[PDB]
Every structure is written in C-alpha cells, then in structure tokens.
Amino acid sequence: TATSDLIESLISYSWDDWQVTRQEARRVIAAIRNDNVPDATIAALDKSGSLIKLFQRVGPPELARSLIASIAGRTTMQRYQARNALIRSLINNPLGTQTDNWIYFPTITFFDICADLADAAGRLGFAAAGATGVASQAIQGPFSGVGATGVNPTDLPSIAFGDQLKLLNKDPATVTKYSNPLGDLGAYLSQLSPQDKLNQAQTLVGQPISTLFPDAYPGNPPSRAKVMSAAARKYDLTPQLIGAIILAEQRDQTRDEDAKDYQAAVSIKSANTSIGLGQVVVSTAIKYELFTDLLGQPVRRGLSRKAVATLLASDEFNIFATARYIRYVANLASQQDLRKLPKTRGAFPSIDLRAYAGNPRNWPRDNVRALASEYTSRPWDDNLSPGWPMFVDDAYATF
Amino acid sequence: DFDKTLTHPNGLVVERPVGFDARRSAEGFRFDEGGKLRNPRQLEVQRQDAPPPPDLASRRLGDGEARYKVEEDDGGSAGSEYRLWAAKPAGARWIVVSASEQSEDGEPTFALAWALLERARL
Numbered sequence: 001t002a003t004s005d006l007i008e009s010l011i012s013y014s015w016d017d018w019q020v021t022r023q024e025a026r027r028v029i030a031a032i033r034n035d036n037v038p039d040a041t042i043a044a045l046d047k048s049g050s051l052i053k054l055f056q057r058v059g060p061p062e063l064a065r066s067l068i069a070s071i072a073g074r075t076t077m078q079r080y081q082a083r084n085a086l087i088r089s090l091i092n093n094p095l096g097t098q099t100d101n102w103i104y105f106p107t108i109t110f111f112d113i114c115a116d117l118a119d120a121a122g123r124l125g126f127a128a129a130g131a132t133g134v135a136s137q138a139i140q141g142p143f144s145g146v147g148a149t150g151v152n153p154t155d156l157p158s159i160a161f162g163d164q165l166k167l168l169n170k171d172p173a174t175v176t177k178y179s180n181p182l183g184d185l186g187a188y189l190s191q192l193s194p195q196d197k198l199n200q201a202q203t204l205v206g207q208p209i210s211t212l213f214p215d216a217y218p219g220n221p222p223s224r225a226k227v228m229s230a231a232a233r234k235y236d237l238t239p240q241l242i243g244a245i246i247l248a249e250q251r252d253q254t255r256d257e258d259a260k261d262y263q264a265a266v267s268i269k270s271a272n273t274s275i276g277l278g279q280v281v282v283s284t285a286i287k288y289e290l291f292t293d294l295l296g297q298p299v300r301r302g303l304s305r306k307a308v309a310t311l312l313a314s315d316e317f318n319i320f321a322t323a324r325y326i327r328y329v330a331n332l333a334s335q336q337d338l339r340k341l342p343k344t345r346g347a348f349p350s351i352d353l354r355a356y357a358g359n360p361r362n363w364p365r366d367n368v369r370a371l372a373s374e375y376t377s378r379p380w381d382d383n384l385s386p387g388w389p390m391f392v393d394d395a396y397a398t399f
Numbered sequence: 400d401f402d403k404t405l406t407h408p409n410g411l412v413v414e415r416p417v418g419f420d421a422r423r424s425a426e427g428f429r430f431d432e433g434g435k436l437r438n439p440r441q442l443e444v445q446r447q448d449a450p451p452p453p454d455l456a457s458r459r460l461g462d463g464e465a466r467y468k469v470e471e472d473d474g475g476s477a478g479s480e481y482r483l484w485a486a487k488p489a490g491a492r493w494i495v496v497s498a499s500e501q502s503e504d505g506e507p508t509f510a511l512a513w514a515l516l517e518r519a520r521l
C-alpha cells in the first residue's frame with residue numbers, strides 16, 4: 001500500500017537520537033491514522049518483516065501507545081498479525097506500554113483493550129469524533145472533578161506522602177480536603193441559576209471523553225454525550241437519566257477527591273473508592289462485571305483489581321459501567337416486594353416497581369428519585385438517602 | 400457534641416448527640432443525623448438482657464472493655480455500608496450500640512457511636 005511503502009521508507013534507516021525517532025514515530029503514527037487501507041498495510045509490512053521492526057524501534061512508551069492503539073483500532077481481519085508481531089517484538093524490550101498511567105496494563109492487554117474498545121465503539125455507536133467542547137477551569141470546590149474539568153484523575157499529582165499517612169490516620173482537616181465537597185445539598189442548588197445548571201450540564205456532557213485510549217478511536221475522542229447516548233441504547237435507559245446521575249456525582253466531587261479516589265484505589269491498601277464520572281466503586285465493577293459490553297471475556301479475566309480501578313477513570317468505561325449498574329439497580333427494583341419496602345413506599349408514594357423493568361421514558365418521577373437514593377446507597381434495603389433524591393431530581397429536571 | 404439527656408422506661412440513660420434526631424424504640428433510642436444529607440449517620444442505643452457472642456473483638460472504652468464487631472456491605476456511590484455492633488457490661492445486663500454509615504475510605508472511626516456508648520448507663 002501507499003502507507004506501507006511510506007513506512008518502509010521511514011524504516012529504511014536506523015535512527016540517530018531520541019528526537020529523530022520522535023519525529024519519525026509521530027509521522028508513522030499519522031500515516032497509520034490517515035491510511036485508508038489499514039488491513040492491507042499491515043499485511044504488506046508483515047510480509048516484509050517490517051511489521052516486527054516497526055514495533056521494535058518505536059521505543060518511548062508514550063509513542064508505543066499511540067502506535068499500538070492506532071493499529072489495534074484501525075485493523076480488523078489483519079489485526080491478529082499485528083498482535084503476533086507485537087508479541088514477538090516484546091521478547092527484547094518488554095517495557096512496551098506498561099508505564100505511568102498505564103502501569104497496570106501488560107502491553108498485550110493494552111493492545112487487546114484497544115481492539116475491544118474500537119470494536120465496541122463502532123458496534124455501539126460512539127466511534128464518531130467529538131467537537132472540542134469547553135471545560136471548567138476550576139481546581140477546587142464543587143464541580144471541579146473530571147466531569148467539569150476534563151482533567152483525568154490518573155494525571156493528577158500524587159498526594160504528598162505525609163498527607164497519605166494523615167488520611168490513613170483520619171486527620172479531619174485532611175480527610176475533609178479529599179472528600180465530598182458538599183454537606184447541605186439544597187443550599188448548593190440554591191446558589192445556582194437555571195442557566196448555571198444548564199451550563200454545568202453542557203460542560204459535563206459536551207466535552208470529549210477523558211479517555212486513556214484516545215488513539216483507539218478513528219479520529220478525535222467522542223463527546224461524553226455520544227457515549228451516554230450509546231449507553232442508554234445498550235441498557236434501555238435514556239442519556240438524560242445517565243446524565244443526571246453523573247451531574248449530581250460531579251457536583252459532589254472535587255479535583256482533590258479525584259486524586260484521592262484513584263491513588264487510594266491503586267495504593268498498598270487497594271481502597272474500595274468510588275471513581276470517575278459515575279463514581280463507580282471498584283469492588284462493585286468487579287462483582288457485577290460492569291465492563292462486560294466494552295471488553296471481551298478473555299481481557300476481562302486478565303484484569304487486576306488495579307487495572308479495573310484505572311479503567312473506571314477512563315470516561316467511556318466509566319459511563320458504560322455506570323449505565324450498566326443503573327439498569328441493574330432498576331431490574332433488581334422491579335423484582336422487589338413493595339409491601340416489604342414501607343420506608344421506600346412512604347418517601348416515594350408514586351413509585352412503580354414494574355415500570356423499572358422498562359425504559360425510563362415511562363418511569364414516574366418517583367422512580368427516578370428512589371433510584372437516586374438507591375444509587376448512592378445500598379440498593380433496595382429500604383434504608384434511604386434523605387438528600388440525594390432531590391439532588392438528582394433537580395439535575396434530571398435540567399436535562 | 401451531646402446535648403439533651405434521654406431516659407427510657409427500661410432505665411437506660413443517654414444523651415442526644417447534637418445535630419441528631421431522637422426517636423424512642425423498643426429498648427432504647429434511635430438517632431438519625433439531622434438535615435437532608437447524602438450520607439447521614441444512624442445510631443441506635445439499646446438495653447439488652449442477652450449477652451454478646453463469644454470471641455467478638457475487644458476494645459478499651461473509658462473504664463474499659465467493650466466487645467464489638469464491624470460488618471461491611473455493598474453500598475452505592477457514597478461507598479460501602481459499614482455497621483458497628485458494640486456491647487458494654489452494665490452490671491449483669493448489657494448496653495448495646497449499633498451504628499451505620501457509608502464510607503468509600505475504609506472502615507469509619509465510629510467515634511460518635513463509641514462516645515454515646517461510653518456515656519451510656521442504667
């Protein structure tokens with residue numbers, strides 16, 4: 001192919017220094033991403049022995065990621081060949097992609113994750129590029145987490161070693177620094193105009209996903225809106241419900257709590273934090289296989305607990321985990337015995353258990369409020385969150 | 400952080416934790432954190448005839464010697480649900496405190512629940 005020839009050339013010579021590789025790598029990457037016959041290009045490079053060479057000399061992990069994500073994502077019938085060549089190449093320099101944000105993914109796992117993700121995006125309808133939407137500039141206080149900011153939790157500076165110890169010791173001022181920003185939920189909503197609310201919703205939903213696998217997409221990453229809508233379709237929900245759940249979480253979220261959420265999850269302690277857009281709990285994602293529809297079983301069986309925590313910090317994975325969990329809460333509700341849930345009955349008089357089994361388009365508003373309570377807290381134990389129902393309801397209204 | 404004194408027909412004496420709502424129950428009082436919080440604390444303090452289970456964990460509480468247990472359930476986005484059960488000798492009887500809250504940051508201190516139990520008598 002045109003692209004194989006081109007790449008054959010950049011490979012026609014060894015590389016002097018770190019910078020040459022840098023520019024040559026960048027150039028092969030773009031060629032791959034703009035190539036219209038990606039399968040035939042891989043087949044040509046395979047034949048030449050050049051496919052293996054390509055992987056061997058795109059050295060710096062940062063660039064190996066872009067290369068591996070792009071190839072895994074763009075190829076189909078020849079993808080197995082790229083995987084084969086990658087594996088062969090790893091024998092020498094095994095470092096591959098397994099560094100920084102991606103330390104919990106073996107390199108081949110990174111390839112397989114990109115492959116599944118690319119396939120799921122096309123299949124489920126969220127491959128299409130998002131518009132460069134605007135993100136909040138906040139770094140503190142309510143709505144300063146990834147939802148508002150677009151800053152991936154995984155990119156945040158380590159919490160100082162000293163403060164980590166203070167967290168472990170439950171030092172009030174430090175715990176406060178790193179926890180839910182909100183106490184009085186109603187008081188927070190009160191300081192927001194309907195326009196402010198609407199602006200938070202747009203900010204939240206309109207910006208590109210903060211993904212850990214950007215090059216697994218054909219072009220730029222999709223908007224969160226696109227991912228939520230795809231997830232609504234897959235789980236028989238609505239993007240508006242998914243949106244309202246996440247917006248509420250994200251108002252009760254700060255940059256600092258993001259940092260805590262992720263770092264504690266991947267620490268010695270392997271804390272069971274709630275992470276990312278929908279604040280999904282690590283143990284919950286594992287126990288209910290919340291990644292089932294984005295990742296194939298082989299990959300899923302290989303993920304360590306910390307790889308799971310890291311995925312929860314990738315917006316698409318989080319959004320699908322959140323949606324799947326919502327559908328799970330609703331299904332479980334539809335199977336309850338309402339006479340055995342009198343507190344629920346009391347707080348939400350128009351609740352309709354049967355309706356939960358179907359699309360939210362038909363839920364009474366009280367189903368939304370009840371589910372909200374049963375999303376922050378244990379589901380359908382008849383013990384309620386006093387404040388989350390109205391908090392989520394308000395966000396729902398905005399959508 | 401305690402205010403009103405509360406006395407049960409069964410002889411149990413405790414204080415109402417400040418910022419909490421008190422309700423009388425079968426053998427004591429229930430306290431639910433005030434306001435409309437995302438994740439309120441819930442406490443119960445009861446008089447109990449039956450002795451605790453053998454071999455529970457043991458902790459020094461004031462003068463000393465409570466036996467307790469902490470259980471962790473799946474919760475929601477505010478974290479797992481944590482339940483304390485704690486018993487102190489009250490002569491030949493027992494005073495018992497149950498407490499609940501969610502935490503995504505590991506086991507809660509339950510400081511307020513321990514306090515309540517410590518300041519409890521009959």
Ligand SMILES: [Ca+2]
Binds near residue numbers: 252
């Ligand atoms: Ca939060």
Ligand SMILES: [Ca+2]
Binds near residue numbers: 374377383384385
């Ligand atoms: Ca509940």
Ligand SMILES: [Zn+2]
Binds near residue numbers: 257273274275279
């Ligand atoms: Zn959290």
